[PDB]
Amino acid sequence: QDTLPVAAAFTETVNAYFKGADPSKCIVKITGEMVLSFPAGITRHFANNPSPAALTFRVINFSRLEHVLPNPQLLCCDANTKEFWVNMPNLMTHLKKVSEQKPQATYYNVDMLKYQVSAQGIQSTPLNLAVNWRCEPSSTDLRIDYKYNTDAMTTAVALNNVQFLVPIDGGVTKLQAVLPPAVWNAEQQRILWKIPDISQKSENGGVGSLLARFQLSEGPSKPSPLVVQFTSEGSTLSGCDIELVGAGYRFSLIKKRFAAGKYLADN
Ligand SMILES: [Zn+2]
Ligand SMILES: [Zn+2]
Ligand SMILES: [Zn+2]
Ligand SMILES: [Zn+2]
Numbered sequence: 001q002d003t004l005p006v007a008a009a010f011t012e013t014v015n016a017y018f019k020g021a022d023p024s025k026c027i028v029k030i031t032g033e034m035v036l037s038f039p040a041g042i043t044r045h046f047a048n049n050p051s052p053a054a055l056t057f058r059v060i061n062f063s064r065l066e067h068v069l070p071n072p073q074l075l076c077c078d079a080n081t082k083e084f085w086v087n088m089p090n091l092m093t094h095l096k097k098v099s100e101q102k103p104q105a106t107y108y109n110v111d112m113l114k115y116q117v118s119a120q121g122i123q124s125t126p127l128n129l130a131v132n133w134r135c136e137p138s139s140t141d142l143r144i145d146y147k148y149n150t151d152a153m154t155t156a157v158a159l160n161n162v163q164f165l166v167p168i169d170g171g172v173t174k175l176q177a178v179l180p181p182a183v184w185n186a187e188q189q190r191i192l193w194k195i196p197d198i199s200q201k202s203e204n205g206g207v208g209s210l211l212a213r214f215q216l217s218e219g220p221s222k223p224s225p226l227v228v229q230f231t232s233e234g235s236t237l238s239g240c241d242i243e244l245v246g247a248g249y250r251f252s253l254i255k256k257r258f259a260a261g262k263y264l265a266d267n
Helices: 042-047 088-099
Strands: 004-019 027-039 056-060 065-070 081-085 107-117 127-136 139-148 159-167 172-179 183-185 190-198 207-216 226-233 241-245 249-266
Touching: 004 127, 004 241, 027 249, 042 088, 088 107, 127 226, 127 249, 139 159, 139 190, 190 207, 241 249
Parallel strands: 004 249
Antiparallel strands: 004 027, 027 107, 056 081, 056 241, 065 107, 127 139, 139 207, 159 190, 159 226, 172 207, 183 190, 226 249
């Protein structure tokens, strides 16, 4: 059983732009990459195997992907499934090069597939947002409504390190009625909320509001984009998975994760 243990990862990035409370105006773009990881020692392995067993895999739910770019050195020579035969001499050349360059490395990550995920508006979005501003001549009311949305992801999984940053115009003298607690950057004139986790297991099922009032010393505030951050582990957005075909290899791990890229909301 000289089967090389190997690892795979899908990593997805969701971009979203929300416009007031109007779902039809939400612009969504999801991208991703599939990466193969080879464990230190592969070089010795290929030293014993000049003509190794072919590395062939199949990507599940392939129809959910569009704009697929296969590694032009390692790949490319029907509905929902696509099979690949990795180019072995080029993979070994590669792995020899990076190994003789980072000999201390515990694994070598190789990019196989770059792709886009067919998205359908606000449904494809793991965190729904609606922002409302009330801009008085000397006062500003800010409301951020968020909703954890399981429909965007393959399996119900938490959002981690969630950040809500928003610039406040008009020269703020004082913060009032701030709920939950946030952090005011004075030098930068902008407010930041942090929630460590959001999910079904969160309070109110992952549905919440961020509230702030601001006293101004200069005119009204002009609303600015809410910028959001979060990461996630244990699920993809695309619903893709990977399988080995043929003998000689084993997946030691298949890591699935996604993260917010440009994730904005306007008034
Ligand atoms: Zn071996
Ligand atoms: Zn096929
Ligand atoms: Zn290379
Ligand atoms: Zn990469």
